[PDB]
């Protein structure tokens, strides 16, 4: 998903986030950049899900930092060459706020809140209930109250190309 120019450019940008003492190639490939530095990058700073994006691409058990390889994975998924299948798969992981494998009413509520902003312009209790009910009506095929991956990939594939 990334060209060689993109990988080499990514390494130079990644290294600018490290202390001077960790900028050798070997040190840089062992380094873990905390989210605070990642969340300020132009590619992420304006993204409403930046905090969820960091978490999903982190490979450390504490899910609180990004390695260079994790950072290449993030760029790979957000590149213009990434397939519709991979984008909807990672979108599902990003929207799964509690990380339990399905999108429930709480996940959908947090997703809507991300789209509007924390609050003023926040949706009211009634507006949120009506929106979530409508989302579930279109997406939850087996009617068990949650949206699993296949339901999600199916609903996305039937939507216009967000290109």
């Amino acid at each position: 998903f990334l060209t060689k120019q993109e990988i080499l450019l990514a390494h130079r940008r990644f290294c600018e986030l490290l202390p001077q003492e960790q900028r050798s190639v070997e040190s840089s490939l062992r380094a873990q950049v905390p989210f605070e530095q990642i969340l300020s990058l132009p590619e992420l700073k304006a993204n409403p899900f930046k905090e969820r994006i960091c978490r999903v691409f982190s490979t450390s058990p504490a899910k609180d930092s990004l390695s260079f390889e994790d950072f290449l994975d993030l760029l790979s998924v957000f590149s213009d060459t990434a397939t519709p299948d991979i984008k909807s798969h990672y979108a599902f992981r990003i929207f799964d706020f509690d990380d339990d494998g399905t999108l429930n009413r709480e996940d959908l509520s947090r997703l809507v809140n991300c789209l509007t902003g924390e609050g003023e312009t926040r949706l009211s209790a009634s507006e949120m209930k009506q929106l979530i009910d409508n989302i579930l009506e279109e997406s939850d095929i087996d009617r068990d109250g949650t949206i699993n991956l296949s339901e999600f990939q199916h609903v996305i594939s039937r939507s216009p190309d967000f290109a």
């Binding site: 993204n47 984008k87 979108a91 997406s139 939507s159 216009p160 967000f162």
Partner: peptide, 12 residues
């Protein structure tokens, strides 16, 4: 379509 808007917010 709600999902179009949410994917555009994420990948746009």
């Amino acid at each position: 379509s709600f999902w179009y808007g949410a994917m555009k917010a994420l990948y746009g």
